Amino acid sequence: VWAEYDPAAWGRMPYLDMYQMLRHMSPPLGLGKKCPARVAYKRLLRMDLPVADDNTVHFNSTLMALIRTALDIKIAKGGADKQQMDAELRKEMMAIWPNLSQKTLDLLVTPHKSTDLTVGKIYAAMMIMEYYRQSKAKKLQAMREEQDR
Amino acid sequence: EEEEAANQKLALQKAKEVAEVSNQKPAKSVWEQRTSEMRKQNLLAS
Amino acid sequence: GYMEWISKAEEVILASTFFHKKERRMRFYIRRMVKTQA
Amino acid sequence: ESARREVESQAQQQLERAKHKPVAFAVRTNVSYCGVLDEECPVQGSGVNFEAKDFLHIKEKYSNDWWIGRLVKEGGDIAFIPSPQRLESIRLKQEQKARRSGNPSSLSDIGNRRSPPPSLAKQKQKQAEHVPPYDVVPSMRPVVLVGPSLKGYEVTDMMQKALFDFLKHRFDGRISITRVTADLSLAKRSVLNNPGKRTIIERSSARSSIAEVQSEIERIFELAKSLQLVVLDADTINHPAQLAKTSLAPIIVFVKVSSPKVLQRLIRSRGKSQMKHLTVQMMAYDKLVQCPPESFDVILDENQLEDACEHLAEYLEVYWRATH
Amino acid sequence: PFFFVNIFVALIIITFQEQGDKMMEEYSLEKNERACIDFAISAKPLTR
């Protein structure tokens, strides 16, 4: 699938292709056609990977999180836990194999940078607001029939 | 393992009674290790 | 485990069946020999 | 002062000479008090730091304020124990360090109501129960074995008989077994001065069974003073708290089946005679099971006879070496 | 032929031990999480 959405195999794919990629592939690797949009956004936050400003997502980095989300491999509750599991998991993979290049190891799992917006952050813009956006129409409604009444 | 666990519990209870005066087994196997994992994954999903 | 416990205590209680009190004991005696490793 | 040193040396000489003498009797305590931190003891550095639920053994006579005792701990040396009058005095000393002890509260009320301490503020009142600091117990603890479900029935009887035999055989020459068909649950000490003192009164309790039950209470005491270990083959008690408020306070041995499922088929092995009586034999089991484990002294929760047999064995020599 | 022989086949399947690999409980993950992550370690997009 990645070969076609990135026909040249640049190794970089802008994220607008990525969401369509997850829709195409069935669970547990992909979202699936019938997945709820908001539930699909939940897994997107679960990815928690830095977003490149060129809209691209790394091939190796993206494949990692999809596995982590599906298999629940020490998925953190959030906050300080995410700061520790990234430190932890990188040590397990280091413990399992020290042969892997450190730069490549940081390529698969980026060192934690709160400055870089997570994959969730772009998608969190829709899901959190879309829950409010439907409420926003209802929010203006809530007074509106009250105003008429 | 039940017999081993019960003996350890009994010895611990023996301490309260006296409190007034006070090879290597191979690690499972390819079948057992996989069988235990499927038990966890099935139970985790439930 | 519990069946053998009460069985040993039951023989402790034992110490023409009335005239031949031994008749109950031969039943007890050869009961012992059956259990023996010999 | 030479007086304190002279009585110090005399106490040590009296203790050294009394290290090899028979024990007089034993007491039961109900307060966590330390006899090593009190400066009024005749000898400092040889006190007793004993908590509650502990046993003391008095041998010789010292005075009306302090006594020479020994602990049931193994290696416990000879120490000094307070008199029952002393602890009542020190109990009043415990509650006097606080700001107030009587009726007048200190809620910003000073110089208005002096409120001299009446008879209510002393130990004269609060006499509805007024439990003594000391209780009279046998010097040697009698042992009572609580059956799985109900005594007097086959399943329990052999369940008890095998343990009784091993007590006879292994510890022969040092253990005496006494069987009491009479009841023991009516052992009360704060009911009356002398209910039914004579059999000719023709009173309700004079001709009742309380007479022989009270007469069997002290029967245990002489056996305990003889240092030869004794048990209680009481056929009426089947629950630990039933004989816990009395002055016996004996060692309760709990033999239990792991699950009710095995017990039901265990009863089935006896025959059709127990099948008539099986139903109430299960209700007596779980009521005893639901009792907290801390109530019993030892638990025999295993199925193997020999492994259970040594379980009670090793707990008994420790009692012997504790008081020797 | 039918029953005992298939016990011999079954007994070897159930008791077969791992191919070396040192100890393999010191690492917490183990299981199948290795094979997926191992693939993620070494991967390349199919160049078109």
Curated annotation (Swiss-Prot), chain A:
Location of the protein in the cell: Cell membrane
Tissues of expression: Brain specific; mainly found in cerebellum, cerebral cortex, thalamus and hypothalamus. Expressed in the small cell lung carcinoma cell line SCC-9. No expression in heart, kidney, liver or muscle. Purkinje cells contain predominantly P-type VSCC, the Q-type being a prominent calcium current in cerebellar granule cells.
Sections of the chain in a coiled coil: none
Disease / disorder: Spinocerebellar ataxia 6: Spinocerebellar ataxia is a clinically and genetically heterogeneous group of cerebellar disorders. Patients show progressive incoordination of gait and often poor coordination of hands, speech and eye movements, due to degeneration of the cerebellum with variable involvement of the brainstem and spinal cord. SCA6 is an autosomal dominant cerebellar ataxia (ADCA), mainly caused by expansion of a CAG repeat in the coding region of CACNA1A. There seems to be a correlation between the repeat number and earlier onset of the disorder.
Note on domains (UniProt): Each of the four internal repeats contains five hydrophobic transmembrane segments (S1, S2, S3, S5, S6) and one positively charged transmembrane segment (S4). S4 segments probably represent the voltage-sensor and are characterized by a series of positively charged amino acids at every third position.
Family as reported in the entry's similarity comment: Belongs to the calcium channel alpha-1 subunit (TC 1.A.1.11) family. CACNA1A subfamily.
Protein name: Voltage-dependent P/Q-type calcium channel subunit alpha-1A
Organism of origin: Homo sapiens
Lineage: Eukaryota, Metazoa, Chordata, Craniata, Vertebrata
Gene: CACNA1A
Curated annotation (Swiss-Prot), chain C:
Superkingdom as given in the UniProt entry: Eukaryota
Subcellular location: Cell membrane
Subunit details: Voltage-dependent calcium channels are multisubunit complexes, consisting of alpha-1, alpha-2, beta and delta subunits in a 1:1:1:1 ratio. The channel activity is directed by the pore-forming and voltage-sensitive alpha-1 subunit. In many cases, this subunit is sufficient to generate voltage-sensitive calcium channel activity. The auxiliary subunits beta and alpha-2/delta linked by a disulfide bridge regulate the channel activity. Interacts (via C-terminal CDB motif) with CABP1 in the pre- and postsynaptic membranes. Interacts with the spider omega-agatoxin-IVA (AC P30288).
Family: Belongs to the calcium channel alpha-1 subunit (TC 1.A.1.11) family. CACNA1A subfamily.
Functional note: Voltage-sensitive calcium channels (VSCC) mediate the entry of calcium ions into excitable cells and are also involved in a variety of calcium-dependent processes, including muscle contraction, hormone or neurotransmitter release, gene expression, cell motility, cell division and cell death. The isoform alpha-1A gives rise to P and/or Q-type calcium currents. P/Q-type calcium channels belong to the 'high-voltage activated' (HVA) group and are specifically blocked by the spider omega-agatoxin-IVA (AC P54282). They are however insensitive to dihydropyridines (DHP).
Protein name: Voltage-dependent P/Q-type calcium channel subunit alpha-1A
Protein source organism: Homo sapiens
Swiss-Prot record, chain D:
Statement: the UniProt record of this protein carries the keyword Flavoprotein: no
Cystine connections: none
Expression tissues: Expressed mostly in brain, colon and ovary.
Region entry Mediates interaction with the alpha subunit, spans: 158-308
Segments passing through the bilayer: none
Keywords per UniProt: Calcium, Calcium channel, Calcium transport, Cytoplasm, Ion channel, Ion transport, Phosphoprotein, SH3 domain, Transport, Voltage-gated channel
A single MF term (Gene Ontology): high voltage-gated calcium channel activity
Chief location: cytoplasm
Location of the protein in the cell: Cytoplasm
Function in brief: Regulatory subunit of the voltage-gated calcium channel that gives rise to L-type calcium currents. Increases CACNA1B peak calcium current and shifts the voltage dependencies of channel activation and inactivation. Increases CACNA1C peak calcium current and shifts the voltage dependencies of channel activation and inactivation.
Family: Belongs to the calcium channel beta subunit family.
Assembly and oligomerization: Component of a calcium channel complex consisting of a pore-forming alpha subunit (CACNA1C) and the ancillary subunits CACNB3 and CACNA2D1. The channel complex contains alpha, beta, gamma and delta subunits in a 1:1:1:1 ratio. Interacts with CACNA2D4. Interacts with FASLG. Interacts with CBARP; prevents the interaction of CACNB3 with the alpha subunit CACNA1C thereby negatively regulating the activity of the corresponding calcium channel.
Name of the protein in question: Voltage-dependent L-type calcium channel subunit beta-3
Organism encoding this protein: Homo sapiens
Gene expressing this chain: CACNB3
